[PDB]
């Protein structure tokens, strides 16, 4: 059903047997340091440890939510520690070219770019050079669509043409609808409801909805009260064919994914 595996250095991720879980590494910095101090790096390692024990297949590590050089000095020790101590592929959640490059150098395995190569096109180049999967998220500086889904597909397509023109092999491309970016609450709902359309593009799809505003908007609930909303988006996502979910609650979300997988026959 997917004629290839996701190549990630020492680890390989099958795309057919299960929905793969990307665990969001929570990266609480030291108000007292700029580097890789014991507390932040240790909390980070503990948290990746726990997400590994809970069912996570990938650990996702982000720098900013803010100069370039800071982002590295912050993010790089996190990667060296987690990669050394947790045997799962790490993805680096940055859009900056220099950041991606350091992170890979430091041991990151996948690039994760919330601007799908548009904020910093050199990033495709890095991806190309190190031969790593890169995630291209849908994003843009405006909410003005003539047709959300057709535009979303258009915009994503633009990211692929950037990735490809830079040397990126089809098999290293992953797409993501960027739910929660550049979309109104109702537009997010509509992307959800049409997610399967992304499949015509022929690439694996990652969905990132964990705890976002639009769940709050529907359910009327704070971020920490959004587990069941997230759950629904994960389920609907998997039914609609997505291959990855990006999630805070690895334990719960792993179980829902596993049950969906058995239902839909994945």
164 binds a second copy (CB under 8 A): no
Report the phi/psi class of residue 145: left, alpha or beta, with left for phi > 0 and alpha for psi in -120 to 50: beta
Dig out the tokens for 221 from the structure.
Answer: 């609930």
Name the residue nearer to ligand PMM (CB basis): 78 or 135. Answer: 135
- Does residue 212 carry a catalytic annotation? yes
Nearer of residues 15 and 256 to a second copy, judged by Cβ: 256
38 vs 63, beta carbon nearer ligand PMM: 63
Applying CB under 6 A, which residues contact ligand PMM? 24, 93, 112, 114, 135, 137, 176, 178, 180, 206, 208, 210, 246
One of 172, 229, 246, 250 touching a second copy (CB under 8 A): 229
The SS3 call for residue 87 is coil
Question: Closest distance between ligand PMM and the C-beta of residue 76, in Å?
Answer: 18
Among 56, 106, 117, 215, binds a second copy (CB under 8 A): 215
Which member of 156, 231, 243, 250 binds a second copy (CB under 8 A)?
A: 231
Least distance to a second copy from the beta carbon of 226, Å? 9
Helix (H) or strand (E) segment spanning residue 176: strand 173-176
Whether 246 sits among the annotated catalytic residues: the reply is yes
23 and 60 Cβ atoms separated by less than 8 Å: yes
Other C-beta atoms lying within 10 Å of the C-beta of residue 185? 15
Cα 27 from Cα 8, distance rounded (Å): 23
**Given candidates 235, 242, 245, 250, which one binds a second copy under the rule CB under 8 A?**
235
Residue closest to 255 by CA, chosen among 60, 88, 54 = 54
Secondary structure (DSSP) of 51-62: HHHHT-SEEEEE
Buried b (16+ CB within 10 A) or exposed e, 160-169: bebbeebebe
One residue of 45, 119, 189, 201 binding a second copy per CB under 8 A: 189
Binding of a second copy by 265 (CB under 8 A) = yes
Rounded to 5 degrees, φ, ψ at 205 are -120, 130
Q: From CA 75, how far away is CA 170, in angstroms rounded?
A: 28
Which of 212, 226, 240, 266 is an active site residue? 212
223 is a contact residue toward a second copy (CB under 8 A): no
Give the residue numbers annotated as catalytic, written as ranges. Answer: 212, 246
Residues in the site for a second copy, rule: CB under 8 A?
A: 189, 192-193, 215, 218-219, 221, 228-229, 231-233, 235-236, 239, 252-253, 255-256, 258-260, 262-265
């Amino acid at each position: 059903k997917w004629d290839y595996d996701l190549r990630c250095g020492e680890y390989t991720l099958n795309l057919n047997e299960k929905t793969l879980i990307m665990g969001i590494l929570n990266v609480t910095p030291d108000s007292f340091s700029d580097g890789g101090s014991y507390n932040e790096v240790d909390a980070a390692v503990r948290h990746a440890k726990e997400m590994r024990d809970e069912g996570a297949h990938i650990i996702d590590i982000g720098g900013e939510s803010v100069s370039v050089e800071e982002e590295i000095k912050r993010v790089v020790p996190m990667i060296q520690a987690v990669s050394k101590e947790v045997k799962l592929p790490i993805s680096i959640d940055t859009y900056k070219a220099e950041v991606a490059k350091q992170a890979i150098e430091a041991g990151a395995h996948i690039i994760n770019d919330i601007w799908g190569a548009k904020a910093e096109p050199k990033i495709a180049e890095v991806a190309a050079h190190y031969d790593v999967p890169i995630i291209l998220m849908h994003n843009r500086d405006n909410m003005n669509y003539r047709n959300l889904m057709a535009d979303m597909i258009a915009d994503l397509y633009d990211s692929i043409k950037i990735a490809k023109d830079a040397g990126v092999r089809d098999e290293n491309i992953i797409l993501d609808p960027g739910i929660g970016f550049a979309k109104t609450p109702e537009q997010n709902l509509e992307a959800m409801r049409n997610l399967e359309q992304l499949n015509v593009l022929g690439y694996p799809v990652l969905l990132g909805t964990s705890r976002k505003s639009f769940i709050g908007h529907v359910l009327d609930l704070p971020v920490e009260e959004r587990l069941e909303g997230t759950g629904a988006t994960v389920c609907l996502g998997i039914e609609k064919g997505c291959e990855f979910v990006r999630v805070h609650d690895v334990k719960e979300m792993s179980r829902m994914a596993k049950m969906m997988d058995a239902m839909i026959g994945k």
